[PDB]
Amino acid sequence: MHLTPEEKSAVTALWGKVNVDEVGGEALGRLLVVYPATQRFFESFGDLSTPDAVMGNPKVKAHGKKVLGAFSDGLAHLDNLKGTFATLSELHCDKLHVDPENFRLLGNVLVCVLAHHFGKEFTPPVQAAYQKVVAGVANALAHKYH
Amino acid sequence: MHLTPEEKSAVTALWGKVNVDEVGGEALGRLLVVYPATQRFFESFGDLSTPDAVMGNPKVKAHGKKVLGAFSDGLAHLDNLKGTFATLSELHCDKLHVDPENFRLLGNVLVCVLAHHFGKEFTPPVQAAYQKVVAGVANALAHKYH
Amino acid sequence: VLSPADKTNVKAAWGKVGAHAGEYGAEALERMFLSFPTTKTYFPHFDLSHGSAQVKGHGKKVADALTNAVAHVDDMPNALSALSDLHAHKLRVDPVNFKLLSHCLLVTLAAHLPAEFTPAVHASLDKFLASVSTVLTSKYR
Amino acid sequence: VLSPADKTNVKAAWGKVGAHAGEYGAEALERMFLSFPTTKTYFPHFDLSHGSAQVKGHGKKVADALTNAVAHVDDMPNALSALSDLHAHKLRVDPVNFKLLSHCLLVTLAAHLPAEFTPAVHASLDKFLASVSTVLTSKYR
Numbered sequence: 039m040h041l042t043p044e045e046k047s048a049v050t051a052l053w054g055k056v057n058v059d060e061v062g063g064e065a066l067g068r069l070l071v072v073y074p075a076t077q078r079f080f081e082s083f084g085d086l087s088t089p090d091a092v093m094g095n096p097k098v099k100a101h102g103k104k105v106l107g108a109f110s111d112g113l114a115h116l117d118n119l120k121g122t123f124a125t126l127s128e129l130h131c132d133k134l135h136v137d138p139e140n141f142r143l144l145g146n147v148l149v150c151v152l153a154h155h156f157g158k159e160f161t162p163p164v165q166a167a168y169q170k171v172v173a174g175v176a177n178a179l180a181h182k183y184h
Numbered sequence: 185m186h187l188t189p190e191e192k193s194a195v196t197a198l199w200g201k202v203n204v205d206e207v208g209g210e211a212l213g214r215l216l217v218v219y220p221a222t223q224r225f226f227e228s229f230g231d232l233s234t235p236d237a238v239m240g241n242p243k244v245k246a247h248g249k250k251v252l253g254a255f256s257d258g259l260a261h262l263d264n265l266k267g268t269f270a271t272l273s274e275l276h277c278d279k280l281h282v283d284p285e286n287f288r289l290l291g292n293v294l295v296c297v298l299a300h301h302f303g304k305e306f307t308p309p310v311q312a313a314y315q316k317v318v319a320g321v322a323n324a325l326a327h328k329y330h
Numbered sequence: 331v332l333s334p335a336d337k338t339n340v341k342a343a344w345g346k347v348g349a350h351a352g353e354y355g356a357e358a359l360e361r362m363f364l365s366f367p368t369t370k371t372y373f374p375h376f377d378l379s380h381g382s383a384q385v386k387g388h389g390k391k392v393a394d395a396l397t398n399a400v401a402h403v404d405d406m407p408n409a410l411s412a413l414s415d416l417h418a419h420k421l422r423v424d425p426v427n428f429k430l431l432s433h434c435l436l437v438t439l440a441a442h443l444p445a446e447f448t449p450a451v452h453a454s455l456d457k458f459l460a461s462v463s464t465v466l467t468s469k470y471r
Numbered sequence: 472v473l474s475p476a477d478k479t480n481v482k483a484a485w486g487k488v489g490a491h492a493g494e495y496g497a498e499a500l501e502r503m504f505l506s507f508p509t510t511k512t513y514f515p516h517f518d519l520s521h522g523s524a525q526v527k528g529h530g531k532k533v534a535d536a537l538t539n540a541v542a543h544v545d546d547m548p549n550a551l552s553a554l555s556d557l558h559a560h561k562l563r564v565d566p567v568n569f570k571l572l573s574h575c576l577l578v579t580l581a582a583h584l585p586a587e588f589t590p591a592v593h594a595s596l597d598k599f600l601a602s603v604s605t606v607l608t609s610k611y612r
């Protein structure tokens with residue numbers, strides 16, 4: 039994907055300070071809370087009945103860490119998101135049956151978490167660079183759907 | 185734009201049966217009727233007071249011919265839509281200020297029109313091929329927005 | 331909101347559908363699966379092959395529901411109550427998908443009702459499907 | 472719909488915005504114009520540069536409308552009647568844009584109210600902005 043030098047540096051710089059374990063858990067937990075329909079993919083995760091239950095669920099935090107970790111990998115290959123995510127794209131379609139619209143929801147929830155965690159440092163221009171990145175990632179993940 | 189040879193033929197073949205002027209007027213009139221917000225760009229066209237006034241407005245009809253003529257020429261360049269529509273993309277953004285969401289609405293109204301026009305010949309597979317084309321064109325027209 | 335003329339248009343167009351409601355429902359689903367493949371993510375348990383009984387059966391349940399809503403166009407919320415709970419608590423279909431099915435139902439109606447599918451009826455049907463979609467996704471959160 | 476806890480959450484959060492509501496409204500618009508460039512198509516007559524007084528002025532009007540909505544959370548349609556008319560009959564902003572502004576407002580709140588922006592509050596605010604959005608586009612057609 040296409041990022042200006044300014045956008046790439048804003049992206050890269052912020053990510054250097056993100057604890058993936060921590061943000062990953064928060065991002066997935068908030069998704070399940072704000073968009074409860076998404077719980078349809080995690081029936082075996084335990085108790086997701088309340089925000090507190092969702093947020094302290096170890097299975098949620100574990101999964102959260104896995105997802106953002108794969109997300110961190112694509113950040114290293116911004117020039118070829120589609121090639122980077124082809125295998126997971128096919129997995130998510132063929133085995134998991136996840137509607138790609140959910141990739142977009144997660145992308146928006148992640149932006150919210152970054153703004154929450156970073157405050158004032160997450161400026162309008164920084165957000166803009168991240169918005170382009172999560173849409174890119176969402177597109178790369180839906181690419182092999184059929 | 186990636187279409188199988190089968191899909192391209194389905195597209196080309198039906199298109200060969202279209203009265204561009206007629207379908208053009210119908211599609212633009214129907215956009216204006218079904219999605220009235222779209223009238224925001226056409227206040228100088230006169231009377232758009234009712235379905236009948238819209239469908240019968242000579243300015244609406246002329247604009248539809250113009251829009252579908254361009255669309256039509258684009259069907260000759262399925263392999264280079266971005267290239268084919270780059271200048272119009274710029275115009276629509278910089279001078280016309282048209283939210284690209286409207287290209288998507290028109291594309292769906294166009295498919296409804298073709299279905300109405302062709303009846304049973306507009307099969308599920310023919311619709312699918314046209315769906316790809318209308319999305320392709322919408323994307324190409326939104327490409328230069330900034 | 332559906333104006334009084336909208337309700338008259340829907341009732342008139344749906345009336346014509348009549349006995350073909352179930353075959354139209356199956357066709358609209360087939361059009362959706364082909365045009366918008368991501369919608370298949372919700373039917374991994376189905377034989378989605380052309381003319382499968384599973385699709386014909388589902389298509390008929392979908393049309394019946396539509397028939398119930400037209401019949402109770404003044405009180406959809408109460409009429410689709412049960413359907414609204416199932417979609418909100420079990421199915422949990424992303425709302426985007428309702429807009430794709432609605433589009434395929436309009437294309438189907440267009441392909442089958444040459445005489446009745448005027449600009450005004452088209453507008454009324456679009457609004458009606460949007461209303462149904464809103465009622466069905468209303469208890470999601 | 473907005474449950475009693477939702478209403479409680481919104482009033483709490485909004486309460487804390489307090490006097491900064493206008494500054495947050497401007498920040499939200501700026502976020503929107505940078506993140507979703509297509510939204511700029513509705514303000515061809517504005518200076519959209521960082522610090523623009525037009526944006527700041529517009530931000531205060533938006534924020535003031537939201538304050539009015541929170542105050543009348545139980546009777547939004549009537550409170551926002553004039554604004555629904557305006558958007559439906561004059562401005563005619565595609566409904567998709569409301570989702571983009573709502574997202575940017577959430578981002579702004581997150582960035583300014585760390586303590587208050589809990590997952591529960593986040594969910595209630597999202598539901599509230601969706602409700603305002605719905606009211607604002609209810610008379611389009």
Ligand code: HEM
Pocket residue numbers: 076079080101104105106108109126130134136140141144175179
């Ligand atoms: C940021 C976008 C995402 C990325 C990069 C991503 C990545 C991954 C990865 C790396 C796995 C592990 C594969 C394995 O070894 O089994 C996985 C599994 C999974 N993902 Fe995604 N994911 C994303 C978004 C989503 C979303 C939005 C959902 C649904 C809301 C979802 C649902 C699942 C499920 C259900 C599994 C299987 C978990 C299990 O084994 O129970 N993913 N994902």
Ligand code: HEM
Pocket residue numbers: 222225226250251252254255272276280282286287290321325
């Ligand atoms: C397939 C999608 C479309 C195509 C191919 C297209 C093509 C065109 C063309 C060829 C022109 C004339 C350019 C010129 O003056 O040199 C034009 C102008 C214009 N278009 Fe688009 N258009 C599309 C969609 C739309 C939509 C959906 C709207 C608004 C809802 C719109 C609004 C306008 C307006 C307002 C003008 C200027 C008319 C005038 O000055 O008389 N267009 N478009």
Ligand code: HEM
Pocket residue numbers: 369372373388391392395396413416417421423427428429431432462463466
């Ligand atoms: C106009 C909108 C819709 C209507 C009226 C509708 C109606 C129905 C009805 C009547 C049923 C059967 C309930 C029963 O057997 O008791 C059902 C089930 C179902 N619907 Fe919805 N539906 C709509 C939209 C959607 C959409 C957009 C999707 C996904 C793309 C969807 C996915 C499903 C699924 C997966 C089932 C269960 C299928 C089965 O296992 O039999 N529906 N719907």
Ligand code: HEM
Pocket residue numbers: 510513514529532533536537554557558562564568569570572603604607
């Ligand atoms: C929560 C959502 C929104 C609220 C509460 C809201 C509220 C308002 C208010 C209070 C005004 C000023 C009316 C007056 O002049 O008295 C206004 C005008 C306007 N709004 Fe909305 N609005 C919302 C969403 C949007 C969105 C998403 C857009 C487009 C991206 C938009 C575009 C405009 C425009 C172009 C004007 C006129 C500005 C001018 O020329 O001064 N609005 N809105």
